[PDB]
Design a protein around this ligand. Structure first.
Ligand SMILES: Nc1cc(COc2c(Cl)cc(C[C@H](N)C(=O)O)cc2Cl)c2oc(-c3ccccc3)nc2c1
Ligand SMILES: *[C@@H]1O[C@H](CO)[C@@H](O)[C@H](O)[C@H]1NC(C)=O
Ligand SMILES: *[C@@H]1O[C@H](CO)[C@@H](O)[C@H](O)[C@H]1NC(C)=O
Ligand SMILES: *[C@@H]1O[C@H](CO)[C@@H](O)[C@H](O)[C@H]1NC(C)=O
Ligand SMILES: *[C@@H]1O[C@H](CO)[C@@H](O)[C@H](O)[C@H]1NC(C)=O
Lengths: 469, 217, 455, 220
């Protein structure tokens, strides 16, 4: 053992040791208080967080347009109560939205027999519509309704007496908001006289109801200036267009179409889409479908797909069907009019199983863009990473940073990234984690050496890397 | 990087005949998405830049004679010349263009075969200006012969000389497919002074006896 | 003259157990059960289920600690059955790894969450977080040197802060119902990992046993402080889970890294910062309860000769085991150097349940060997055997979750054998060790005025 | 026409940098990227890198990264390759090349190569010495004439006869390197009527020391 009670007390008593005990008490408290002052110093002399910008629901991920309820389903089941069945698919796509292509009672080119308020009974009843809409709310899919008046006709706003047509809409928006829809799509605004003024009125009506409702305009236009003019007076309008459509058909122009438009609008909110209505595959050749899905899900803004983009549907592949409204391929039954023409891999069922499939890439990306604060509303910095590459970093104040590297040209790179002139806040790491590639045969999850990386023709990469103070 | 083996390294062939280069790539250069093969052939004549012959394995460049046919897929590729002309002697390189940076083959030297011919032999006494330098150079030219293999004896007052002798062959002449060769002997002025009779004699497979030229200073 | 006096009244005994059970767990761990249950219904059932399992285990310790009144708790109950070496191999792992890592981890959770409302959207600065962890550990080993009445008044205060925070959470849940089962991962291989990931949030129920010897009336109050607490915890847990499900959708709880803070953001708006601060103050309570309890484990280990004699010494005018406390603080702060920390604890997933299973197996063997030993509690033998059988399954599950890491842990357990043979079997024979041991001992006694306890 | 052209010859003392320079003509210079390729003797072509004249971005093979440096001058259609840390084994011919498509690497248009020699031995202008047959010269119908080029440096010396007029029947033998100075000789054959009756000159020319010399072949 050691010293006894009495023995320890008698020796401890010595004034030297009593002063030492007093000294060390005081020393300990001084050291802890020093550390307390030190930690308070660190807390104050340290970088603050950036306030999260207030985000409407349509910032938080992809919308999804259904131009004809019949073509999405097959006939007979082509009604709103049919669509109420499908939302578990949509919830799997993580689509924070829907757009029901027009369901109002339109008679072709007849201004007087057309109404924007009564629904066309082929699709069901308002009692069906509400049943859907309540289910969609329950499943976190907001629903927009498309109000373009003459949708069975040639010219969607009719040829004549446009102010009566605008009056129909002015009334319609109020009714359908009271019914509980989250917003409205209108189309073909190049066919509408005095377009900017009517959009300004309808936008005022919508935001004047509530701040969490939107109006999605759409135009057939691909002119940067025309589009910037429709977006001048209206400032929280999504305006879908053909602007990315004229891509050069081996991607070659896209780095430039995208970074001009961001620059020109001043990095406001945007909606990326290759059209106001038609499929991606109406424009892209099919080697780029994967590459565009990587890009549309990772630019600043709300991407928009038409139905079946998520599976690379194509109107031409099963001949005779209209390029307006191709029949969606759920499973091998889905186009029975020429049986045996449907291959397994062309269908939702046939892709849902396969990690390599297009729909397995869409599902995966939709996740990232809807959870990760950096893709949800980070900044965007393009840089010259390589010959073909469109490359850019999405980032937010300290969260995860995402570098995207799209190889649009048809020649692989064999020599790494080699970034000229990164912003000093956003410098590239020596290595970053592959979160996915557009191509099979990659070590997903693993860190890559950016100076010694090798992209194939058309290989896009999504690299994830952590912050630096 | 990709690596391209090329063979044969030499391909000696006769005028009018068909010839074949093989190029062999360490990866496939078929682009699945587009169903064409990324390869090109360049001809480099002696003393000139590379000229592009064909690209995407078969597409002739404009201003290319139609005797160059390129073919193959995957990794076995061949440039063929249907009927070799005297103007075609060159190194030929294959290059991939499936990745940037590209890479090239080590190249096939095409050589021409012709009817054998004996050298025109000529010998030149030292230049009267050179004699100012304290040195002198004696030069023997062997012109327009085939094949390349040759040897030269230098004799000086009958003594055989093997120090300070140098040789240079031309590349094979594209008009006539003959070689030519220069032989040089360099002397001090006093070494050129002390001896009287200089001989260059050349042995070439077209003659049993050597060909001879000589001069007396 | 000098001993650890019986300061702990029943309500402070309930504080030492509820304060160390409620932990960080319920405010951030719900996500772990939804991940393996899929369904709010199956989740809310396994929360109740590992509750009643924990009650059944605690009722075995409510027996053991009345049969054996030593403050070694989980360690003493091994020593009184399996003898010298098996008890040491426990104490070594507790000393070297489990208690100082646990103390540090929960202090760092105190630091981060207490700071969090200065840094809402981003990391709290790491060089600040480690100081504010160390200031906490240092302060509570100061307080637990000054007086056991101060120590237990601190844990009354923070045990109250914890239950107040859960009451506030539950109340806002019912208010949201006043304002107006799903897809289930029904595989047994999913359910077992749901249950095993939930049991962590009850871990702590054994901690009262390491302070049996300082209870005012152990034979009454030690089983009562268990039954007054674990049913209360179980109720509060199933109600708190219920409250989260009124406000956070399944997708949101599967993907939020601080569950209580999201519930705070939804209900309190400008005042949301209250819930982060309560998770912080909640963890402070757990550091104090752990430091207190932990100091007694090493004290007892030295009294029974397993551990160097300085740790048995007490300060005569304050009656707190100052060298054991000081050792426990220092051993905690030595974990502040490590760039990663949770891994070192994850290596011993199996160890807690293994020791518990060995204690209750011990209670079976102790009933066969010495029926004449006094037993104020005598539980129906069904419950021990049920609980043992269940733990032997969970120990296997703990390996099956990660067969590498439980092997690393088992490798480190064998580090106890070198130290046992050098420290116990060798009798410290070399005079250049033995005289140095003594010289260091008498220095420490002099340096902080401490003396051996009196039988 | 499309035509790239380059300086002929560069001498570099080991370890020093050099600028090799390439002026384009006959096309819109910003539309097409410019590539630099090299040809080590007896060892096959190797590609350095390329540059975009529209924004001065440049991409380089792993072997050259940081060792090379491309820039460009849009005001003159000129591309410049800096090379640095040059060793003896970086002696080569450096070729400037243009792509067909905008940056894709296959090379229809090449500049005539810049011959880069890396050596400490000094620039040395050539000494030219004419050769005439002497004894029994006119006894044959065709007569050969010659021009020794001796002790010069660096490698590229050019010979043409009568200002390129006698481009038929000329043999110029590759240079021989001796004691870090080159030796070369050139030869021509003409009718026995021509040589004593007419001007004959080797028009020797040397890019790297600017000397141009027209020695007349006069009988002994
Ligand atoms: N063998 C063993 C034993 C204990 C002690 O017993 C526990 C205690 Cl004292 C507290 C908790 C968590 C607590 N119930 C809470 O709600 O945070 C779990 C266990 Cl197993 C461990 O604690 C921890 C632990 C404590 C806090 C954070 C992270 C890990 N690991 C342990 C390993
Ligand atoms: C449109 O709304 C804005 C507020 O968002 C308001 O300033 C403006 O006066 C409104 N105009 C009309 C005609 O409603
Ligand atoms: C867009 O609409 C205008 C006006 O009717 C028309 O002139 C133009 O050709 C249309 N373009 C497309 C691509 O539809
Ligand atoms: C577009 O980008 C350039 C980048 O240099 C910038 O100078 C310019 O101000 C931006 N905006 C417009 C309208 O050109
Ligand atoms: C799907 O499978 C078919 C049949 O094997 C094949 O021809 C085709 O290339 C595949 N891809 C698509 C999208 O059709």
């Amino acid at each position: 053992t050691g010293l006894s009670k009495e023995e320890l007390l008698k020796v401890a008593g010595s004034p030297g040791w009593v002063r030492t005990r007093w000294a060390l008490l005081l020393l300990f408290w001084l050291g802890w208080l020093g550390m307390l002052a030190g930690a308070v110093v660190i807390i104050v002399r340290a970088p603050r967080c950036r306030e999260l910008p207030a985000q409407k629901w349509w910032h938080t991920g992809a919308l999804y347009r259904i131009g004809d309820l019949q073509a999405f389903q097959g006939h007979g089941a082509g009604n709103l109560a049919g669509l109420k069945g499908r939302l578990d698919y949509l919830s799997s796509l993580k689509v924070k939205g829907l757009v029901l292509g027009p369901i109002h009672k339109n008679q072709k080119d007849d201004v007087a027999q057309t109404d924007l308020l009564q629904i066309d009974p082929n699709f069901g009843s308002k009692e069906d519509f509400d049943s859907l809409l309540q289910s969609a709310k329950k499943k976190s899919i907001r629903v927009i309704l498309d109000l373009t008046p003459n949708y069975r006709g040639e010219n969607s706003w009719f040829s004549t007496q446009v102010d009566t047509v605008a009056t129909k809409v002015k009334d319609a928006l109020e009714f359908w908001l009271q019914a509980g829809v989250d917003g409205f799509q209108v189309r073909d605004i190049e066919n509408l006289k005095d377009a900017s003024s009517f959009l300004a009125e309808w936008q005022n009506i919508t935001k004047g109801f509530s701040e969490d409702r939107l109006l999605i305009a759409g135009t057939n236009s691909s002119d940067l200036q025309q589009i910037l003019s429709l977006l001048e007076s209206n400032k929280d309008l999504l305006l879908t267009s053909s602007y990315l459509s004229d891509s050069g058909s081996t991607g070659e122009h896209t780095k430039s179409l995208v970074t001009q438009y961001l620059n020109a609008t001043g990095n406001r909110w945007c909606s990326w889409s290759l059209s106001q209505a038609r499929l991606l595959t109406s424009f892209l050749p099919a080697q780029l479908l994967r590459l565009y899905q990587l890009m549309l899900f990772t630019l600043p803004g709300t991407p928009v797909f038409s139905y079946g983009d998520e599976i690379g549907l194509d109107a031409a592949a099963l001949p005779g069907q209209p390029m307006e409204a191709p029949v969606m391929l759920w499973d091998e039954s889905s186009f029975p009019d020429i049986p045996g023409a449907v291959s397994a891999n062309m269908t939702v069922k046939g892709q849902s199983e396969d990690p390599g499939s297009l729909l397995s890439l869409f599902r995966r990306l939709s996740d990232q863009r809807s959870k990760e604060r950096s893709l949800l509303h980070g900044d965007f910095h393009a840089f010259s990473a390589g010959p073909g590459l469109f490359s850019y970093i999405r980032h937010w104040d300290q969260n995860e940073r995402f570098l995207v590297v799209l190889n649009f040209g048809d020649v692989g790179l064999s020599a790494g990234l080699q970034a000229s002139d990164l912003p000093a806040s956003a410098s590239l790491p020596a290595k970053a984690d592959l979160l996915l590639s557009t191509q099979p045969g990659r070590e997903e999850g693993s860190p890559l050496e950016l100076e010694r990386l090798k992209l194939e023709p058309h290989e896009g990469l999504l690299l994830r890397f952590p912050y630096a103070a | 990087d990709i690596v391209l083996t090329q063979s044969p390294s030499s391909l000696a062939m006769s005028v009018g005949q068909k010839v074949t280069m093989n190029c062999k790539s360490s990866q496939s250069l078929l682009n699945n998405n587009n169903q064409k093969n990324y390869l090109a052939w360049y001809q480099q004549k002696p003393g000139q830049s590379p000229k592009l012959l064909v690209y995407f394995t078969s597409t002739r460049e404009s201003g290319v004679p139609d005797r160059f046919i390129g073919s193959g897929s995957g990794t076995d590729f061949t440039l063929t010349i249907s009927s070799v002309q005297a103007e075609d002697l060159a190194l030929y390189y294959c290059q991939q263009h499936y990745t940037i940076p590209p890479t090239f083959g080590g190249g096939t030297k095409l050589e021409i075969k012709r009817a054998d011919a004996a050298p025109t032999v000529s010998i030149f006494p030292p230049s009267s200006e050179q004699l100012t330098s304290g040195g002198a150079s004696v030069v023997c030219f062997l012109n327009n012969f085939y094949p390349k293999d040759i040897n030269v004896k230098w004799k000086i007052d009958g003594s055989e000389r093997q120090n300070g002798v140098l040789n240079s062959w031309t590349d094979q002449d594209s008009k006539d497919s003959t070689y030519s060769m220069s032989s040089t002997l360099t002397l001090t002025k006093d070494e050129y002074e002390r001896h009287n009779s200089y001989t260059c004699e050349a042995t070439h497979k077209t003659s049993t006896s050597p060909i001879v030229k000589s001069f007396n200073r | 003259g000098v001993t650890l006096q019986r300061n702990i009244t029943l309500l402070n005994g309930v504080a030492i157990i509820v304060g160390t059970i409620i932990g960080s767990g319920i405010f951030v761990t719900p996500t772990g059960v939804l991940k393996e249950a899929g369904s709010p219904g199956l989740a809310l059932v396994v929360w109740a289920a590992c509750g009643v399992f924990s009650i059944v285990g605690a009722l075995c310790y409510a027996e053991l600690g009345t049969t054996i009144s030593k403050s070694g708790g989980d360690y003493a109950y091994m020593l009184e059955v399996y003898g010298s070496l098996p008890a040491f191999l426990k104490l070594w792992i507790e000393l070297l790894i489990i208690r100082p890592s646990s103390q540090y981890i929960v202090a760092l959770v105190f630091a981060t969450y207490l700071l969090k409302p200065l840094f809402p959207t981003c990391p709290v600065p790491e060089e600040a977080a480690k100081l504010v962890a160390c200031l906490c550990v240092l302060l509570l080993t100061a307080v637990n040197c000054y007086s056991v009445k101060a120590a237990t008044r601190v844990q009354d205060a923070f045990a109250a802060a914890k239950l107040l925070a859960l009451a506030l959470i539950i109340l806002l849940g019912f208010v949201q119902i006043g304002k107006g089962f799903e897809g289930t991962k029904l595989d047994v291989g999913n359910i077992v990992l749901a249950l095993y990931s939930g049991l962590f949030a009850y871990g702590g129920w054994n901690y009262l046993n390491f302070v049996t010897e300082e209870m005012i009336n152990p034979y009454r109050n030690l089983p009562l402080a268990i039954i007054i607490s674990l049913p209360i915890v179980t109720l509060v847990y199933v109600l708190t889970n219920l409250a989260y499900f009124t406000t956070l959708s399944t997708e949101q709880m599967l993907s939020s890294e601080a569950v209580a803070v999201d519930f705070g953001n939804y209900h309190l708006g400008v005042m949301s910062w209250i819930i982060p601060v309560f998770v912080g103050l909640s963890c402070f309570g757990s550091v104090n309860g752990s430091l207190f309890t932990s100091s007694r484990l090493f004290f007892v280990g030295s009294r029974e000769g397993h551990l160097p004699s300085i740790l048995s010494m007490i300060h005569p005018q304050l009656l707190t085991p100052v060298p054991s406390l000081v050792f426990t603080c220092v051993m905690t702060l030595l974990y502040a150097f490590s760039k990663d920390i949770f891994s070192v604890i994850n290596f011993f997933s199996f160890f807690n349940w293994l020791c518990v299973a060995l204690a209750i197996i011990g209670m079976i063997w102790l009933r066969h060997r010495k029926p004449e030993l006094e037993r104020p509690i005598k539980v129906n033998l069904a419950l021990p055997v049920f609980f043992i059988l269940a733990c032997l399954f969970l120990i296997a599950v703990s390996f099956w979750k990660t067969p590498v890491e439980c092997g690393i842990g088992f490798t480190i357990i064998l580090s106890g054998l070198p130290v046992y043979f050098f420290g116990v079997w060798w009798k410290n024979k070399p005079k250049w060790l033995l005289q140095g041991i003594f010289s260091t001992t008498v220095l420490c006694q002099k340096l902080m005025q401490v003396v051996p306890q009196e039988t | 026409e499309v035509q790239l052209q380059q300086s002929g010859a560069e001498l570099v003392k080991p370890g020093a940098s050099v600028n090799l320079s390439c002026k384009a003509s006959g096309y819109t210079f910003t539309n097409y990227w410019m590539h630099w390729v090299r040809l080590r003797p007896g060892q096959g072509l190797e590609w350095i890198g390329e540059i975009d004249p529209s924004d001065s971005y440049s991409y380089y093979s792993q072997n050259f990264k940081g060792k090379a440096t491309l820039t460009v001058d849009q005001s003159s259609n000129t591309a410049y390759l800096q090379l640095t840390s040059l060793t003896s084994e970086d002696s080569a011919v450096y070729y400037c090349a243009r792509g067909r498509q905008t940056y894709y690497p296959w090379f229809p248009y090449w500049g005539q190569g810049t011959l880069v020699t890396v050596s400490a031995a000094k620039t040395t202008p050539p000494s030219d010495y004419p050769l005439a047959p002497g004894s029994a010269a006119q006894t044959n119908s065709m007569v050969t004439l010659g021009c020794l080029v001796k002790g010069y440096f660096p490698e590229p010396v050019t010979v043409t006869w009568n200002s390129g007029s006698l481009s038929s029947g000329v043999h110029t033998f590759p240079a021989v390197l001796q004691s870090d100075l080159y030796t070369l000789s050139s030869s021509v054959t003409v009718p026995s009527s021509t040589w004593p009756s007419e001007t004959v000159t080797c028009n020797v020319a040397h890019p790297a020391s600017s000397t141009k010399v027209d020695k007349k072949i006069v009988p002994r």
